[PDB]
Amino acid sequence: LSAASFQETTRVLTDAAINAKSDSLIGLKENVIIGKLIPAGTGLSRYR
Amino acid sequence: ASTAPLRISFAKIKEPLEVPNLLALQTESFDWLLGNDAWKARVESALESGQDVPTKSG
Amino acid sequence: PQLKLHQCGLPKAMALELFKPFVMKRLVDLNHAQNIKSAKRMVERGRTVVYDVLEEVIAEHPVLLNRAPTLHRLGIQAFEPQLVEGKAIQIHPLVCTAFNADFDGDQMAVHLPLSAEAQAEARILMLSSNNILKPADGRPVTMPTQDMVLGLFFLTTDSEGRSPKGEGRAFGSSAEAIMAFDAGDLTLQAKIDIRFPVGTIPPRGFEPPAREEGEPEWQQGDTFTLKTTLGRALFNELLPEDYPFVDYEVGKKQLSEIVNDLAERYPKVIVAATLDNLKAAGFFWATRSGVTVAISDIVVPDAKKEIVKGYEGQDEKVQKQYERGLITKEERTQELIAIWTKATNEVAEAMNDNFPKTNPVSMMVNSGARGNMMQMRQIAGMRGLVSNAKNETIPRPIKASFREGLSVLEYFISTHGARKGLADTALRTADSGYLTRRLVDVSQDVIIREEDCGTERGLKLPIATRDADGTLRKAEDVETSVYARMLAEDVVIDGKVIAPANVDLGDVLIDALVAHGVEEVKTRSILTCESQVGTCAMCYGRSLATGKLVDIGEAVGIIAAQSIGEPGTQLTMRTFHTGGVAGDDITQGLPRVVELFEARTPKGVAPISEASGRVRIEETEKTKKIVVTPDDGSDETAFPISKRARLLVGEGDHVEVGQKLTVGATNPHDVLRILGQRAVQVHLVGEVQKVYNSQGVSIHDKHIEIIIRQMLRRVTIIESGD
Amino acid sequence: HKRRLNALGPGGLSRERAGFEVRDVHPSHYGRMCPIETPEGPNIGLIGSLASYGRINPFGFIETPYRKVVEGQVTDDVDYLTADEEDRFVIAQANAALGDDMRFAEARVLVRRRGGEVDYVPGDDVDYMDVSPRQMVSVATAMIPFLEHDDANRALMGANMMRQAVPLIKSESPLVGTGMEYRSAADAGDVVKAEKAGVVQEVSADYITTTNDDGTYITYRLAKFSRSNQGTSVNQKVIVAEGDRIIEGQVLADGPATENGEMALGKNLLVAFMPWEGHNYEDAIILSQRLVQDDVLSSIHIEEHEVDARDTKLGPEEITRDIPNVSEEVLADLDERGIIRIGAEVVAGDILVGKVTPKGETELTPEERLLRAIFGEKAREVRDTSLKVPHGEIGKVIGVRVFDREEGDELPPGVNQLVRVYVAQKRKITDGDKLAGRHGNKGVISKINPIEDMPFLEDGTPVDIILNPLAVPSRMNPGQVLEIHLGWLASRGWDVSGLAEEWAQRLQVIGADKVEPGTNVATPVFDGAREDELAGLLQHTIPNRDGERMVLPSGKARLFDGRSGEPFPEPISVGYMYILKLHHLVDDKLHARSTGPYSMITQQPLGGKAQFGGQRFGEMEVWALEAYGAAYALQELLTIKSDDVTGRVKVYEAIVKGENIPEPGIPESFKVLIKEMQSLCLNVEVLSSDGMSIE
Amino acid sequence: LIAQRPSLTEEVVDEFRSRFVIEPLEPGFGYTLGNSLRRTLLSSIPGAAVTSIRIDGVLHEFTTVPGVKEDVTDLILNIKQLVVSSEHDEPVVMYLRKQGPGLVTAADIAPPAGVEVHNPDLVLATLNGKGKLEMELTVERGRGYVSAVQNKQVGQEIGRIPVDSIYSPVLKVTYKVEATRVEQRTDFDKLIVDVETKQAMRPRDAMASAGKTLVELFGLARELNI
Amino acid sequence: AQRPSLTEEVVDEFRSRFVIEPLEPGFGYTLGNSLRRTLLSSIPGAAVTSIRIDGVLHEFTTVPGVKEDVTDLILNIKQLVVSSEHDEPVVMYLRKQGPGLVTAADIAPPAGVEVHNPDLVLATLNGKGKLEMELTVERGRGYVSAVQNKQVGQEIGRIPVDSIYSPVLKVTYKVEATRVEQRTDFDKLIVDVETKQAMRPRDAMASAGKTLVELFGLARELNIDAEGID
Ligand SMILES: [Mg+2]
Ligand SMILES: [Zn+2]
């Protein structure tokens, strides 16, 4: 998700489809795409 | 012209040429396009003074 | 200018629109309406009770102000909203550097957090009172500036050229001093002996000259007397009572030091109060400073005439010797550029000499309010040589300041550089934006997840180098490099612990260690951090923005990217003129920063010796070459080099494992290959800081180290079948 | 706008394709394209402006005039040369010293030679000379007095922003200006001129009737409060009385921003350069409340609200006064034909034009048909589409125009009636507006002081505006101080006849030695007033009370503190400067939103002010909130404040009723993203660790 | 120490210009008091002005009246600078009527009983040979300045045009502080407040009103405490 | 229109805060500076105009038997508060012997003169005291710098000192806007005034009010006009 968001969306998504590689929610960018509390600041599970 | 309001000028040298019409670039060109009477007058006037002019309207 | 640091005045219609649903709820609850739809109708009608209810409701609802280009976290800040008339948003005068917002038609956007958590975070984390220190270097950003500093400088300046009155008199208090000032028989800046009562803390410098007496005088907490000036006695009433007295011109840099000390020593509320008091005093005394630009206050030095005439005569001689045919046109040019550079610098120094220090422009420049000395040179003495078309240097300069009046051709020549600079800025905005985007995408998700990894490794940073004449002096860049970085382990030089382990490395430790003679220090760092979960707080150090220890969950990567991206627009490093040079001139400025950060091979690449050896030249007319054969029974190596190489290593000489051969920019790949990993880290950090601190921009080395750590996280594998 | 030389367009360059050498002034631009006037954005160097003396050749090249310097003696024989024929000649300067005989005086005559190479020559060698020392400059930049005392950056900014000046109710030409307002206004088209000689006959405000000397009559009809493309007014005012002998070309009425046929884009204000309690800090501006009372910087702005009556499938739309189900007061101010009455004052929500849809297929299902049949009252199903004032606007209805299909008025296919209502408003200068001068010295308005609070001179006159002196040297435009000094000098006229001093000698040989108070002065952009003359004249400024000359030869005057009364410690620099009111108006910029029009594909707030749009919270701001660690705020404003239909509805419901804001959900942008890349044939399934995670 | 109580005089230089001298003042005390007088004079001394107008056959201010060389907006610019003194608490209407050619000035106005126009040379418009003007000027007395927006209170008369009322009757006030010749260790000072006023009042009445205002304001502080 | 009112808050016995509640725009800056200058430079009181220490000279720096320099003695004395009802340059005596400290409690006031701060320390005596000093109290108002008063000329020991006749030592004013019935240009005035031990702050405020009321009744009596009030 983060790599597709940054650059080379076609190449990144094609490689991800070939590899059948899944994305885990962990990350900042890829957690603002889905619209979730970022894993930083006060959004950490400790503070949640 | 001579009827302009009063304004006191500090110019120390005299320009022998006054600024031409500030819209000649458009009106003259479009007169050449339509080739109307103003453009013909301009053409004959330029020919009398031996200038370079477009003799064929747009 | 009447706002507190945590206050914003927002227009009436804007506040009405943003807070609509709350206004309807309050109107219904206060029985001003029987139903929500009627409340909506009346709110649309703009009744008076609606306005009173808006005043009631905006309280205790923090409001996030923002400017369009958000170059760092102090570009969106939370304020407490107060309801104001007009059609414009009222903002504090000294938060204009955090936003970069000058009042020339700039605009501000504004947002309203809704949830309890959202506004709680707004007030606790984002409030303008808390955000006083920049994250890039730790220097305070919300501090007085421009007219405010010109006012405190007038307050605490000397009496030179200020025709003092009542100098040498003695006063039993400052109240008596202001009585004399009102009477017209004392000046705010006249040397006078003032008595200060119990509670006043004397100057740190003046204490050892305490009053002689058999009894032990409580210099900390006793009445004392000081040969001060009235303005300084007034200035020291703005600072908190416990603060030591200040007895010097607080122009711009000393005010920055005082604000930094206040922030690092006193709690945030008192620091904000002190900032407000300093703001009020600075404005108040800036009004009466007497700084008013007039055509006479721009003083053209009488030196300029004769200097420019004599150098003009020399130019005439050079032109005559060109037209006679002895020299070429290029020689004539270079000679005239040298002549007129001499003339320009001579006129600049004469202009600096001429004006008094009580001049308006001199006051605002020397106070560090607004201005430089080149600007004054152009305005008063001389404009000088300018970038000709196609990035060249006009031989003939502009021999006239703006006060004297540029000629026609002088103005036509001068507009070249203006246009070029405007276009350069327009492009560099987007260039820096792209650079910051890449830095953020790389460094994002490097988050402090660990309180403390139990490492004992660190960097061997020079603590007090520069032993020029055998004198231990604090290094010139401890502020960026070694400051804020904690200590790996206890440092002992005399058999006792000078600095305990893992403690914040502030200036007091620096003075201790430089006095005791050390020349290095072992600091914990992210580069040497070994933690299971990403980075740890202790190795990173202290957050340059909050001052305290880095809190777990800090998005340090985004902070580092923003810190490196902020000054990107203002670098402005590129060749003024072509100078008939290519290749030798490596890329300068933001191009250089992208070159280092992308790992792209430098444009002016120069090979670096693989091993210590004997190096000689095997130059061939078809192709020049430099060949080094190493000792210790090693294989020889060679480098193809251009004819124009300006070699910095002689033939048949002894090179070492990690030395350059020709003048240029070493590849980071080489420094990683032949030297090692600490070497490439050091080289990259130093090379980026080179341009950054050549401009004067100051970024802590941690923010670069984050990117460098991300750049070296992967290894290319070989012999991998097993 | 009519002298531009555009480059970005069809058959030419583009924004990104253009490099540098096109965006940079060339040595051949001298006299043909303006170095200084240029956009301050992406279009730098692309969009330009013809010089004052430029002439487009038949082939399309620009030509500039040059006096033929024949064997070193100047002549009036002007030849127009283009850049290519210009690069074969040696060109002197118009300001080169010259004697009574036209032969050159000094041996060294500076010349602009081929390749942009200035290099002096003997003089007989010289072959051409510039016809004017402002040949290089354009018209707008020629407005600026003391241009040579400004860096090109601020001259460029000033020329750019002089074009945004709003026209004011009463317009006065600048007290200190160039010799260029008259010709600039006359050669434009807003100044009513005389076609032929004659005598004026009837002079109302609306028309001027003149009896020609050839035996004919002409009645010039004058425009009165006519809206412009940008919403200003084109009111015209007469200059002649009903006995005046006219000549062809003479000005009979003046257009907006003109006085006696001379441009007047702003007003002369009395300014003192000083800091003032941190209100003109960082380029802000302080001005007295006099300018609000006197309406010195006021303007009239007109807004049109056009509405059309259509013919839908269910019938025709009609402009009917009897709007369905409304109170009597809302349409009490509506004509019998449904349109608002001229002269009425309007506020947000006022029905400018009443219109009704023929009917709405809202509830006519068999159930509703049975209900209506049993009721016996066929409830009207018409939609109230009445034109209303956009929220945030006020004014008086200055006009109404109605086009119709039944009459001969043409209309586009589909519309039966077209009603265009013009609503006019008067804008007084308030805190938020933007003033500027002719030197790029612009700033917003921060405070309006009571007339007593403002500093005042010795005899009591307050100053009008307060400007920070910090900007002048740092921004490096020390021409506004010269303008200020000459403005004060002109307001308090001088009498320097017969002093036998150099500056006085020059001023009396020119003919400016004696000048009555209030006279307007001309400062040619490269032949203007000298600094020495300004200083000398300042010593001989006609006094007011006895010999009172508030301003000393230092250019400075002693002021008093209007809030305490004590004299200020040192003299201040005061004088008259021309301040322009720019079209950047605070009223338009104020943009606010709570809820409103979302977009179609992405369920996000729309942009633009007229749409009541939202504010683009770019990704840089997301970085800022992430750096702060503000987790819940970012989640709330990425989902609840945008792109979460259920969240958007429920947050509003909770606030109006009073309740906790609900937990966010899945953005609709994510849903459309996954559907899009599914249509790209990627099996993008939101998976849980135990299966398929909730969409 | 010095028992000289302050004393006030009046010099007269023109019919509406007067210098008022206060000699027995402490040093460094003339400026503050003179500026308090200047502030109160320029701020809060009552006068009167035209609150509104109404021309025949005119519904708004953005139109023209036939035969008149000036627009209604220019007419209002001329009306707002009318120096008129009233004596009625309630508004009193004031009519102007003119026909045929002629510069309609302020002298042509027909003020009611208890109202006066103190500038008869004010040129209000210039009619044509076929121009007629019929105006209904409402005069009201207040202090300071009130905008046309605040003067707006009724709408049933579609034809009225509320205008801005410059109530202030004083024109410009300055002052000075000189040195009293008295030989003293403190060198007392002499205040010279120079008042010029519009024709509605003499400077003496403006000074009296300013003094009354200030006396009341400071008697608040004096009497209220103990 | 609105009736401004005066309220006072007492922080201690030496200074107090005075708040002037809603007034019209710009009236805050009419009341503020005038009240400040009147409170400061109009109220009458007594101060020590000169001092003669036994066997001393004006140029002679210190005093034998006294550790404090002459300048320190001058400061300690011009800090002294005294109230003189005699309307003449009375002279007050202070006699001290032996070592110790000499306070203002040991002054010898004539009938009518009084020193209100008895615990002020004038000097410290080492060894033999022999401190006999006569100081010339005087009456006045304001602040007079120690211009040559011919006090050294009459007798060398008698030296001139700066005189703080004014009971109020310092006072500062500030004008801050207040929200008063939908209007936001109404001002309120804050005056913080400190005063020596002579009189309370409220008494000084009342005296300044009296002085200003008379000073502007002067102008009010030019004619019985009626600007209006409350
Ligand atoms: Mg700006
Ligand atoms: Zn670690």
Please list, residue by residue across D72-106, b when 16 or more beta carbons sit within 10 angstroms of its beta carbon and e when fewer do.
Answer: bebeeeeebbbbeebeebbbbbbbbebeeeeebee
Work out the number of other CB atoms within 10 angstroms of the CB of residue E108.
Answer: 17
Q: Which residues pair with E117 in a beta bridge?
A: E84
**What are the CB-based long-range contacts (under 8 Å, 24+) for D666-671?**
D666/A34, D666/A35, D666/D695, D667/A34, D667/A35, D667/D638, D667/D639, D667/D643, D668/D602, D668/D603, D668/D643, D668/D644, D669/D602, D669/D603, D669/D604, D669/D643, D670/A33, D670/A34, D670/A35, D671/D695
Instruction: For D133, name the nearest residue in chain B, comparing CA atoms only.
Output: B15
Chains E and A: 3 or more CB pairs within 8 Å of each other: no
What are the backbone angles phi and psi of residue D285, rounded to the nearest 5°?
-135, 145
The answer to whether D256 and D232 are in contact (CB under 8 A) is: yes
Say how many Å lie between the CA of residue C454 and the centre of ligand 2: 7
CA D208 to chain centre: 30
SS3 content of chain D, % helix, strand, coil (to 5): 20, 25, 55
Name the DSSP class of D70.
Answer: B
In angstroms, the CA D628 to CA D178 distance is 54
| Sequence-ordered alpha helix ranges (H) in E44-131 | 72-80
Entry resolution (Å): 3.0
Site of tokens 């008025």: D409
Pairs of residues, one from chain A and one from chain D, whose beta carbons lie less than 8 Å apart? 50
Sign, Cα dihedral of C320, C324, C327, C332: positive
Strand, helix or coil for residue D393: coil
Cα separations (Å) of E18 from C408, E12, E26, E209? 54, 5, 23, 15
F55: left (phi over 0), alpha (psi -120 to 50) or beta: left
Copy the structure tokens of residue C453. Answer: 């990894």
Pairing verdict, β C63-66 and F91-96:
unpaired
The binding site of C for Mg(2+) consists of 102, 104, 106
In angstroms, the CA F74 to CA F1 distance is 52
The answer to whether D257 and D164 are in contact (CB under 8 A) is: no
Outline where DSSP puts E strands in C444-508: 448-450, 459-461, 491-492, 497-499
Q: Which residues from E are below 8 Å from D456, CB to CB? A: 174
In angstroms, the CA D372 to CA F196 distance is 91
- Please count the CA atoms within 13 angstroms of the CA of D469 that sit on its side-chain side: 31
In angstroms, the CA C628 to CA C616 distance is 6
Copy the structure tokens of residue C329. Answer: 């046109």
The answer to whether C482 and C685 are in contact (CB under 8 A) is: no
Work out the number of other CB atoms within 10 angstroms of the CB of residue F5.
Answer: 13
Sheet holding D245-246, edge to edge: D217-221, D207-212, D198-203, D245-246
Sign, Cα dihedral of F64, F66, F72, F77: negative
Work out the number of other CB atoms within 10 angstroms of the CB of residue E120.
Answer: 11
CA distance C161 to chain D (A): 14
Strand, helix or coil for residue E36: helix
**Nearest Cα to D635, choosing from D662, D657, D674, D653?**
D662
In angstroms, the CA D481 to CA D496 distance is 22
Work out the number of other CB atoms within 10 angstroms of the CB of residue D524.
Answer: 22
In angstroms, the CA F161 to CA F166 distance is 15
Name the DSSP class of C384.
Answer: B
- CB within 8 Å: F25 and D452: no
SS3 content of chain E, % helix, strand, coil (to 5): 20, 35, 45
In angstroms, the CA F132 to CA B5 distance is 87
Q: Which residues from C are below 8 Å from A46, CB to CB? A: 552-553
Copy the structure tokens of residue C347. Answer: 């006129």
Q: Which residues pair with D176 in a beta bridge?
A: D521
Copy the structure tokens of residue D28. Answer: 């051949």
The answer to whether C681 and C712 are in contact (CB under 8 A) is: yes
Site of tokens 């570009």: C75
Q: Chain A neighbours among D 653-692 (CB < 8 Å)?
A: 664-667, 670, 673, 677, 680, 682, 687
CA distance F162 to chain C (A): 9
In angstroms, the CA E134 to CA E53 distance is 10
Instruction: For C181, name the nearest residue in chain E, comparing CA atoms only.
Output: E28
CA distance C516 to chain A (A): 41
The answer to whether D221 and D208 are in contact (CB under 8 A) is: no
The binding site of C for Zn(2+) consists of 453, 529, 536, 539
**E47-167, superfamily in CATH?**
DNA-directed RNA polymerase, insert domain (2.170.120.12)
Work out the number of other CB atoms within 10 angstroms of the CB of residue F88.
Answer: 10
Pairing verdict, β F158-160 and F45-53:
antiparallel
C195, C200, C203, C209 alpha-carbon torsion, rounded to 10°: 60
- CB within 8 Å: D623 and C70: yes
The answer to whether E2 and D529 are in contact (CB under 8 A) is: no
Q: Which residues from E are below 8 Å from C182, CB to CB? A: 28
- CB within 8 Å: F25 and D563: no
Work out the number of other CB atoms within 10 angstroms of the CB of residue D595.
Answer: 15
Method: cryo-EM
The answer to whether D352 and D388 are in contact (CB under 8 A) is: yes
Q: How many helices and strands in chain D, by DSSP H and E?
A: 14, 35
> Residue D443 class from Cβ within 10 Å (0-12 exposed, 13-18 middle, 19+ buried)?
buried
CA C4 to chain centre: 25
**Nearest Cα to D473, choosing from C360, C677, C107?**
C360
The answer to whether D309 and D417 are in contact (CB under 8 A) is: yes
**Nearest Cα to D419, choosing from D355, D348, D336?**
D355
In angstroms, the CA D348 to CA D332 distance is 16
In angstroms, the CA C223 to CA C260 distance is 28
In angstroms, the CA C598 to CA C609 distance is 23
D172, D175, D178, D182 alpha-carbon torsion, rounded to 10°: 30
One-letter identity of residue E68: V
Pairing verdict, β C76-83 and C7-10:
parallel
Helices C590-598 + C408-443 axis angle, to 10: 20
Pairing verdict, β C637-640 and C625-630:
antiparallel
Helices F201-220 + F28-41 axis angle, to 10: 110
The kind and range of the H/E element at D582 are none
**Nearest Cα to C179, choosing from F40, D7, D561, D62?**
F40
A9's CB contacts (< 8 A; 6+ apart) are none
What are the backbone angles phi and psi of residue E32, rounded to the nearest 5°?
-65, -45
- The answer to whether D277 contacts chain C (CB < 8 Å) is yes
The kind and range of the H/E element at D23 are none
Instruction: For D533, name the nearest residue in chain B, comparing CA atoms only.
Output: B10
Say how many Å lie between the CA of residue A27 and the centre of ligand 2: 20
Work out the number of other CB atoms within 10 angstroms of the CB of residue D176.
Answer: 30
The kind and range of the H/E element at C37 are helix C36-45
In angstroms, the CA C553 to CA C556 distance is 9
Q: Which residues pair with C522 in a beta bridge?
A: C460
F65's CB contacts (< 8 A; 6+ apart) are F125, F126, F127, F128, F129, F130, F131
E155's CB contacts (< 8 A; 6+ apart) are D345
Rg of chain E over all Cα atoms, to the nearest angstrom: 22
In angstroms, the CA E83 to CA C609 distance is 95
The answer to whether F51 and F40 are in contact (CB under 8 A) is: no
One-letter identity of residue D577: M
What does CATH list as the number for F45-165?
Answer: 2.170.120.12
Output the 3-class SS for D81-112: EEHHHHCCCCEECCCCCECCCCEECCCCECCE
- CB within 8 Å: C444 and A28: yes
The answer to whether D292 and D448 are in contact (CB under 8 A) is: yes
Per-residue DSSP letters for chain F? -----EEEEESSSSEEEEEEEEE-TTTHHHHHHHHHHHHHHTS-EEEEEEEEETT--SS--SBTTB-S-HHHHHHHHHT--EE--SSS--EEEEEE-SSEEEEGGGEE--BTBEES-TT-EEEEE-SS--EEEEEEEEEESSEE-----SHHHH-TTEEE--EE--SEEEEEEEEEE--BTTB---EEEEEEEEE-SSS-HHHHHHHHHHHHHHHHHHHHTT--------
Strand, helix or coil for residue C500: coil
Strand, helix or coil for residue A19: helix
In angstroms, the CA C645 to CA D153 distance is 41
CA F40 to chain centre: 8
One-letter identity of residue C394: I
